[PDB]
Design a protein around this ligand. Structure first.
Ligand SMILES: *C(=O)[C@]1([C@@H](O)C(C)C)NC(=O)[C@H](C)[C@@H]1O
Ligand SMILES: [Mg+2]
Lengths: 233, 240, 250, 244, 212, 235, 222, 231
């Protein structure tokens, strides 16, 4: 049993017709202090999987090392390490899910919420969630922390059920994700303007986008707001 | 720890360490067990090479395992103490958990199990001891007499002997003991036990020990004078 | 791996001999001569510093060792075995005595602890006996001055005077003629030097001879003042110069 | 592997004997003779030190007779170092029993414990047995004065008079000849010394070659005293009995 | 929970209710509170349901091993002590158990042992365990005799559970009856309390307070 | 000396091959499987007339549906039986059902090769394990100290094994009744035994679906011996 | 302080027919007032004509189902591909649950299938392993809403025959698979209306001698 | 000679005799054949009986839905190694939701057998195994020796008189490799191959044992009247 110290906030994600999108801001908070502004919380594994992590950063860095070590180990005595016997999103997730549940069962959890996004060998979209309790679930849209409360509602308007996935293009999906990140910046007190976004497509592969910023923000209406009720000036 | 396999098979299918443990029993002083109709008697030889002994304190050959069961033996004296101790502990453990004293068969099975364990455990040699376990089951008046040996096999006997010159006294018992009509009284059973030892013992002075066990935890050891009277009566009848 | 030698390497032979102990005593016999003499007001222990090479600094190799402030030791036989025994002897004097009673052990009990370690190497699994015989000299309040010998078997005997190693048979005879119960410490040192000269072939001086005494308390060697009851160590190793001074009156 | 070098100390011979026990007994037969004699009013322990020297410090020396508690003592025959290991174990058992039951340990219970330890070394562990034979002289309020002996096999027996070590055959014959049941301590003292004087391999029996002890009720009123004899006291009893 | 068991001339009567509650919620009305350890031994359920099911099924395994090894039926004393010694090892851990180990052997006759998760083991003639035990005790104590018939004894046990089922909120559902003889136990049926209450009320004239 | 788990140049484990020689010295045990049941029979072989023969327990119950007969160093079999009984009962506890005869045999045979430098040597005893389950019906197995077990329609182990097996070769057929099997065990036991066969120095037992495992009384066996004598004298 | 348990909501329902058995469960997965997934399968085919669901804390529920599926696999290896009977599966699950008696799987488990006589069977477990064969059992969040309805409409409790006035009970006539599915659907529709953790979708697994069949139905998503 | 007392001892020519004696136990064992195409992999095993009353010793063991082996030598050792494979296959499924690769299964068997050849006290395994399987890279056939050596092959045979079947497969190499989408014809080739190792005795209904795994075919064993088709 511990308490989380340096923390990362929402990770958001969704499926589209040919793959999956995942995003997370670049902030490492220290309570109310916005301590570290250059933290990458999307960690790619191979060319077909991206693991997005929120919660305790020290535990994230541990998980990051486990995944790095997993790729090394898979290559050992494996001529098809970059082909048929490469690491799948489903393999990477199940490994993490095992670790998370084992650690909670020893009363010493990895204080995180994790979303594994990727594309399988047969082109199928993979998107599944796991957290410090070892709880797992899948859905067309997935989000951690504040994202669950604010992002999912917006992303579910695009893909409300399974049958909406083939109807959703990568442009529409990315637009919804970027808009969600803006909303989280308006309303999450432990968020930052800078973020990273990753697209895993079955045709065009892994596209990792760094140093993105929230833009097209509405603040002008603030000038008209005065006082807290009766005040006119 | 010391893990060496001392008891092992040989090409002809024998475990020599178990067989050499029997040779230690052959060297040991003679012990005999005879069960009557309502009693069991345990006879034991005391070699008279050792005089100037203190018979008060010297370890007696027959040992009480519980108030209703006794154990005599032939072979290594030091080894017998370990079996007796384990048996005594198991007897109290059985009373504690089952709320009933051990049967003679159960106690025998336990001791035989310990002996067997030492024939296929690493770093240990077999017990150089064969035992005669006798007594009466709780609330039962049927006499019980069992034998064990280093290998771990055990069985029930109408009458049996173990130790040095046991071949001779077994020869005697085989012709003198009738199954259809065993020694009806305590006297008859003790007499037959002393007679069988007199085939081997040498002198009937302090060389013979007798212990009579009866139902309902009634165990008593005979004194020198009491035994000497049996020795006198046997030889006087023989002079004819 | 694992130490799979869990069985005794010292066993009784048909004749009743414990071979490895006998052979250990044979190794002690080959060793350099060392001796001990007890006086009325002290004890002396001495041995030859057999230098393996003239390039070697024989001062660094200490054959005579302090075990406690009032107890010293010397040996004959295998030096490395002696060195580790001194380390164990020093530690056991603390762990099994000083940390319990708040004072250093008496000579006989420390000897007893050393003997125990040597006995165990004679019976425990996967080990040979120590190839040394020790002469332990010491003093304590209630027993006074004392001198003990300790063999590879673990057996120990108290001596008025004795010798071990190369020329022990001749040396013991020499000590029998000279020893009496009215000897002062200086007289015992004088006799020790005479006795040791017989077994030495080459050079005989303060640089080739190692000699220490258990005598009066040395407040100058204590290292601090202010506590009346702490009067300093009775063990003192004689210097090269101090030995040579007594060799002139020899 | 290591099997190659294993002597196998805990095995039977084809004849059914324990090799190492038999060879340990052979070792003990060369040790200094120790004699115990039990009387109605006490017990005597006499023992011969092996070929001593004139430079041996006798008054502070102890190789034969050891004290286990206030009521029980032992005479040693064999490896002195091996005996001291067992002696310290026995001293602890006596104190454990005293702590538990708040009563001094009965002699036989102490003897059985030590004998069981010796037995263990012959049946398991792969180690050599202790090359030691004890004579236990002790007293308790159940059996009174008691003499026992134990040997490396772990077997122990009770005695009125007994010898261990060298020349036991000759010694046991001499004791069997002159011993009587109504004997007293002062007489037993004389018998013990006379027996050693005849069986000794030395030219003459002197005070410096002996250790002596008595367990007497000869203490002020109902209690028991152990007396380990001093060199001068052994010299006096040698003159008194008329040996020197 | 209401469970009882009492010794009498014709052996032992065991009677239990059938209700299981989690707070105010009635989880089940058809619970089996008598374990059939083997054809000659019975055990009752009070407190923890899993603890009872698990460990008394386990007890049946130990009793089977006993008679395989000893070639003889296990005594009620020995069987009860196996269970009491087991729960005693777990004392403090939070096991919840209150059971009557009931049996009929040659050497003992009809025997009942109350066994507890506190390690208590008591031999006795009458036992009642559960939230409705006091109600059952009232009917038992006033009507019990050693010389009851098997028919009357069975009814007394049935009626005593009914008494508790009525008053105790955490007892009810149905009544299970057993009769233990030397040749083994005999099941005497499941009796719905709903139907039994009205049947008893009319035939016995009892429960005049209640309108029917 | 040499390792306990050593291979011979022929590719066999010395200790296992030597334990088989000990089993050859053991008393004869015979098993015959039929569609009406499996029969188990043994030679008691008392070393002296004073030995009460009824205390010789070479046929043993494992569960109600599984029996067992032994041959060789019979003391070694006690821990094997203990494990078998525990395995049978434990499986019933975990799965609320009888345990398959094969599965029970496999559990016993897993102990066999757990020896080295675990126990110090292999078992010096062979077992005939007979039983019934719903899946494979009536079964007879032969469990060796090598860890190998064969299923048999009929099998003999012990000193008179090769002679008895040759006799079982001719006599066994798939339509044998239980009564026919009982007499056949007695016939072959009598043939290979040193002493004359009677109800005191030989024992019978069987396992049926209805009644389970049963050791035969000396009175019951005596009648089957008398029935055997008459039918042999009949031609 | 770290709390190793959580509540994922959901509701499950098992009903045993004459020669069939159904095990139903909603597909909604939640924490607190948020929806994690609108379709997260909760009832599983475990092989050997057995269906299983472990409702409550989903991590423990997934762990248990995973371990039982594993137990079925090893039962085949160890016992010559023998079919694991529903009663044997039930006992096995007790030992899995009681194995963690002092750190329990925080789930209410239900399995369903056919017994060895071919009749419909449902078994119901508590978190620490106490189990029992039942004809009818709802489990989870809306269990208190559903069970009374099933007592009334399956077992005809408190229902009597007109004209007799409380004297003659309504006879316990057997329900067909079509009739049971109607009661399951109405149970979940009603539960969805009045319980916030129930909704999104209903998934039913039907077990017969022919095998395991699946049926899915929409539920209100508010 | 002097260097065969235990597995820890090299001979003067650099040989491990205890391993070679364990290898000899395989040659004494009954013949078994393994072969594969691009779609399917087949095991054919000649089972051995003690006598006419006895059953025929089972030779084939299933390890997973997609993998299994046939044995030749000490059957208890095959049980130990097959049990280990079952666990490793099962660990891969539970932890990684991943079917264990046949090549990786061979690597694990090699390393387990190796530890028994370098340490004092233990002994080498006395059995040879033929592992077949269908994974993400198609059909596979492995040959395991208790020295530790594992070899991936198109076809092979181990046991007594195995050289005859091994030569046949070496001739038929080009034919049977092409048998794709036809399980019956691939088994026929396996049955014809094992027939080259027979003397005196012939393939009967309770003598023959066949197993197959493929693209849309779980590892299934055929015994009894199920193999009468191929006799
Ligand atoms: C009875 O003891 C009881 C029953 O629910 C179980 C099924 C035995 N246990 C309880 O904890 C509650 C309070 C019931 O009385
Ligand atoms: Mg709702």
């Amino acid at each position: 049993t511990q308490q989380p110290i340096v923390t990362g906030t929402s990770v958001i994600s969704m499926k589209y017709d040919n793959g999956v999108i995942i995003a997370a801001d670049n902030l490492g908070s220290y309570g109310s202090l916005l301590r570290f502004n250059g933290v990458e919380r999307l960690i790619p594994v191979g060319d077909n999987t991206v693991v997005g992590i929120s919660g305790d950063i020290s535990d994230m860095q541990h998980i990051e090392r486990l995944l790095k070590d997993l790729v090394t180990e898979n290559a050992y005595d494996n001529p098809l390490a970059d082909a048929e016997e490469a690491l799948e999103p489903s393999y990477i997730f199940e490994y993490l899910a095992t670790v998370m549940y084992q650690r909670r069962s020893k009363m010493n959890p990895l204080w995180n919420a994790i979303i594994v996004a990727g594309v399988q060998s047969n082109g199928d979209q993979f998107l599944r969630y796991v957290n410090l309790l070892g709880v797992t679930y899948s859905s067309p849209t997935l989000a951690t922390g504040f994202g669950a409360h604010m992002a999912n509602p917006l992303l579910r308007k695009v893909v409300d059920r399974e049958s909406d996935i083939p109807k959703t293009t990568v442009q529409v999906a990315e637009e919804a994700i970027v808009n969600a990140m803006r909303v989280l910046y308006y309303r999450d007190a432990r968020s930052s303007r800078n973020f990273s976004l990753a697209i895993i497509d079955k045709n065009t592969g892994l596209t990792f986008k760094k140093n993105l910023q929230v833009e097209n923000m509405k603040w002008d209406f603030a000038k008209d707001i005065k006082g807290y009720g009766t005040q006119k000036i | 720890g010391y893990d060496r396999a001392l008891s092992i098979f040989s090409p002809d299918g024998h475990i020599f360490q178990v067989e050499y443990a029997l040779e230690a029993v052959k060297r040991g002083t003679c012990a005999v067990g005879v069960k009557g109709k309502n009693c069991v008697v345990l006879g034991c030889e005391r070699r008279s090479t050792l005089k100037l002994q203190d018979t008060r304190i010297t370890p007696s050959k027959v040992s009480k395992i519980d108030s209703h069961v006794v154990l005599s033996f032939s072979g290594l004296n030091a080894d017998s103490r370990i079996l007796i101790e384990k048996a005594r502990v198991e007897a109290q453990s059985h009373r504690l958990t089952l709320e009933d004293p051990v049967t003679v068969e159960y106690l025998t099975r336990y001791v035989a199990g310990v002996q067997q364990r030492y024939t296929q455990s690493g770093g240990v040699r077999p017990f150089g001891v064969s035992t005669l376990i006798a007594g009466f089951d709780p609330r039962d008046d049927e006499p019980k007499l069992y034998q064990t040996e280093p290998s771990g096999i055990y069985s029930s006997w109408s009458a049996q002997t173990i130790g040095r010159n046991s071949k001779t006294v077994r020869e005697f018992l085989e012709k003198n003991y009738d199954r259809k009509e065993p020694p009806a009284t305590v006297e008859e059973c003790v007499k037959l036990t002393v007679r069988s030892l007199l085939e081997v013992v040498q002198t009937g002075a302090k060389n013979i020990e007798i212990t009579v066990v009866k139902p309902d935890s009634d165990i008593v050891a005979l004194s020198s004078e009491e035994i000497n009277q049996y020795v006198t009566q046997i030889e006087q009848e023989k002079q004819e | 791996m694992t130490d799979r030698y869990s069985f005794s390497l010292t066993t009784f032979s048909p004749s009743g001999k414990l071979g490895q102990i006998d052979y250990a005593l044979t190794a002690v016999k080959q060793g350099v001569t060392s001796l001990g003499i007890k006086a009325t007001n002290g004890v002396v222990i001495a041995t030859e510093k057999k230098s393996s090479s003239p390039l070697a600094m024989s001062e660094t190799l200490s054959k005579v060792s302090l075990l406690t402030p009032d107890i010293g030791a010397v040996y004959s036989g295998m030096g490395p075995d002696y060195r580790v025994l001194v380390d164990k002897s020093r530690k056991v004097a603390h762990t099994s005595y000083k940390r319990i009673y708040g004072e250093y052990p008496p000579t006989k009990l420390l000897v007893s602890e050393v003997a125990k370690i040597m006995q165990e190497a004679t019976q425990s699994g996967g080990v040979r006996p120590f190839g040394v015989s020790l002469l332990i000299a010491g003093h304590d309040e209630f027993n006074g001055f004392s001198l003990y010998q300790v063999d590879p078997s673990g057996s120990y005997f108290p001596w008025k005077a004795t010798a071990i190693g190369k020329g022990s048979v001749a040396a013991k005879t020499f000590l029998e003629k000279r020893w009496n119960d009215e000897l002062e410490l200086e007289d015992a040192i004088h006799i020790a030097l005479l006795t040791l000269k017989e077994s030495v072939e080459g050079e005989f001086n303060g640089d080739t001879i190692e000699l220490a005494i258990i005598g009066d308390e040395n407040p100058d060697l204590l290292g601090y003042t202010g506590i009346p009851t702490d009067k300093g160590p009775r063990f003192r190793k004689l210097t090269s110069q101090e030995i040579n001074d007594r060799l002139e009156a020899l | 592997g290591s099997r190659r070098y294993d002597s196998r100390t805990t095995i039977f011979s084809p004849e059914g004997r324990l090799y190492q026990v038999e060879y340990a007994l052979e070792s003990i037969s060369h040790a200094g003779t120790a004699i115990g004699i039990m009387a109605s009013d006490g017990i005597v322990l006499a023992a011969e030190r092996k070929v001593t020297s004139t430079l041996l410090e006798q008054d502070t020396s102890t190789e034969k007779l050891y004290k286990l508690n206030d009521k029980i003592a032992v005479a040693v025959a064999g490896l002195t170092a091996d005996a001291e290991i067992l002696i310290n174990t026995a001293r602890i058992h006596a104190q454990n029993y005293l702590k538990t039951y708040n009563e001094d340990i009965p002699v036989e219970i102490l003897v059985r414990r030590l004998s069981d330890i010796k037995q263990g070394y012959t049946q398991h562990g792969g180690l050599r047995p202790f090359g030691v034979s004890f004579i236990y002289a002790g007293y308790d309020d159940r059996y009174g004065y008691q003499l026992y002996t134990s040997n490396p096999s772990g077997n122990y027996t009770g005695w009125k008079a007994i010898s261990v070590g060298a020349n036991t055959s000759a010694a046991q014959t001499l004791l069997q000849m002159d011993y009587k049941d109504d004997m007293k301590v002062d007489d037993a003292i004389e018998l013990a010394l006379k027996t050693l004087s005849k069986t000794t391999d030395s030219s003459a029996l002197t005070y410096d070659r002996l250790e002596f002890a008595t367990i007497r009720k000869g203490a002020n009123d109902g209690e028991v005293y152990q007396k380990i004899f001093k060199p001068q006291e052994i010299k006096d009893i040698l003159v008194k009995t008329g040996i020197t | 929970t209401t469970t009882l068991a009492f010794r009498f001339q014709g052996g032992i009567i065991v009677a239990v209710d059938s209700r299981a509650t989690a707070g105010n919620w009635v989880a089940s009305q058809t619970v089996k509170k008598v374990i059939e350890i083997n054809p000659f031994l019975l055990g009752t359920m009070a407190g923890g349901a899993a603890d009872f099911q698990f460990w008394e099924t386990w007890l049946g395994s130990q009793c089977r091993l006993h008679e395989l090894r000893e070639k003889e039926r296990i005594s009620v004393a020995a069987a009860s002590k196996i269970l009491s010694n087991l729960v005693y090892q777990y004392k403090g851990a939070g096991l919840s158990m209150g059971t009557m180990i009931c049996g009929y052997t040659r050497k003992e006759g009809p025997t009942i042992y109350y066994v507890d998760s506190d390690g208590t083991r008591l031999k006795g003639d009458i036992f009642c365990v559960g939230s409705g035990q006091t109600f059952a005790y009232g009917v038992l104590d006033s009507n019990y005799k050693w010389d009851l018939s098997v028919e009357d004894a069975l009814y007394l046990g049935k009626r005593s559970i009914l008494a508790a089922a009525h008053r105790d909120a955490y007892s009810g559902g149905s009544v299970n009856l057993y009769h233990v003889t030397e040749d083994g136990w005999i099941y005497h049926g499941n009796h719905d309390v709903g139907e039994l209450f009205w049947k008893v009320k009319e035939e016995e004239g009892s429960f005049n307070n209640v309108i029917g | 000396d040499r390792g306990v788990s050593t291979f011979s140049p022929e590719g066999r484990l010395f200790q296992v091959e030597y334990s088989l020689e000990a089993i050859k010295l053991g008393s004869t045990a015979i098993g015959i499987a039929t569609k009406e049941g499996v029969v188990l029979g043994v030679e008691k072989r008392a070393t002296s007339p004073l030995l009460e023969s009824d205390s010789i327990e070479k046929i043993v119950e494992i569960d109600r549906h599984i029996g067992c007969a032994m041959s060789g160093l019979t003391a070694d079999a006690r821990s094997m039986i203990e494990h078998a009984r525990t395995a049978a009962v434990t499986h019933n506890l975990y799965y609320d059902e009888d345990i398959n005869v094969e599965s029970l045999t496999q559990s016993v045979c897993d102990l066999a090769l757990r020896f080295g430098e675990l126990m110090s040597r292999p078992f010096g005893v062979a077992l005939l394990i007979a039983g019934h389950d719903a899946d494979d019906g009536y079964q007879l197995f032969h469990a060796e100290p090598s860890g190998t077990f064969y299923r048999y329609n009929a099998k003999a182990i012990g000193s008179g094994s090769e002679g008895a097996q040759a006799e079982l070769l001719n006599e066994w057929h798939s339509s044998l009744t239980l009564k026919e099997a009982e007499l056949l065990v007695l016939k072959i036991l009598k043939q290979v035994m040193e002493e004359k066969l009677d109800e005191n120095n030989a024992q019978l037992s069987c396992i049926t679906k209805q009644d389970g495992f049963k050791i035969y009384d000396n009175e019951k066996t005596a009648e089957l011996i008398k029935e055997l004598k008459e039918k042999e004298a009949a031609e | 302080q770290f709390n190793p348990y959580g509540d994922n909501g959901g509701t499950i329902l098992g009903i045993a027919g004459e020669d069939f058995a159904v095990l139903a469960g909603d597909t909604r997965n939640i924490t607190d007032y948020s929806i994690n997934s609108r379709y997260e399968p909760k009832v599983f085919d475990c092989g050997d004509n057995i269906v299983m669901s472990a409702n409550g804390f989903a991590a423990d529920g997934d762990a248990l189902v995973k371990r039982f599926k594993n137990s079925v696999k090893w039962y085949h290896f160890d016992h010559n591909d023998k079919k694991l009977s529903i009663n044997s599966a039930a006992r096995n699950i007790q030992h899995l649950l009681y194995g963690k008696r002092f750190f329990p799987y925080y789930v209410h488990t239900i399995i369903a299938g056919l017994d060895e006589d071919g009749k419909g069977a449902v078994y119901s477990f508590d978190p620490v392993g106490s189990y029992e064969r039942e004809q009818c059992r709802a489990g989870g969040a809306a269990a208190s809403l559903i069970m009374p309805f099933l007592d009334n409409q399956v077992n005809f409790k408190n229902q009597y025959e007109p004209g007799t006035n409380g004297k003659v009970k309504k006879p316990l006539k057997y329900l067909s698979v079509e009739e049971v599915i109607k009661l399951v659907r109405d149970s979940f529709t009603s539960a969805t209306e009045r319980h916030i953790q129930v909704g999104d979708g209903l998934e039913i697994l039907i077990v017969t001698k022919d095998g395991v069949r699946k049926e899915f139905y929409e539920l209100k998503r508010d | 000679n002097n260097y065969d007392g235990d597995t820890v001892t090299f001979s003067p020519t650099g040989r491990l005799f205890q391993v070679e004696y364990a290898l000899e136990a395989i040659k004494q064992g009954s013949v078994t054949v393994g072969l594969r195409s691009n779609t399917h992999a087949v095991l054919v095993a000649l089972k051995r009986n003690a006598d006419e009353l006895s059953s025929y010793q089972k030779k084939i063991i299933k390890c997973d839905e997609h993998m299994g082996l046939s044995l030749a030598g000490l059957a208890p050792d095959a049980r130990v190694l097959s049990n280990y494979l079952r666990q490793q296959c099962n660990y891969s499924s539970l932890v990684f939701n991943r079917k264990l690769a046949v090549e990786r299964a061979g690597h694990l068997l090699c390393d387990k057998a190796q530890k028994n050849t370098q340490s004092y006290g233990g002994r080498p395994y006395g059995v040879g195994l033929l592992i077949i399987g269908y994974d993400k890279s198609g059909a596979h056939l492995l040959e395991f020796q208790p020295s530790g050596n594992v070899t991936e092959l198109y076809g092979t045979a181990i046991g007594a008189r195995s050289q005859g079947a091994k030569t046949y497969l070496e001739r038929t190499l080009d034919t049977f490799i092409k048998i794709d989408g036809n399980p019956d014809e691939l088994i026929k080739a396996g049955v014809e191959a094992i027939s080259q190792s027979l003397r005196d005795e012939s393939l009967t209904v309770d003598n023959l044992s066949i197993a197959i795994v493929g693209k849309d075919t779980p590892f299934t064993i055929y015994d009894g009247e199920a193999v009468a088709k191929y006799i």
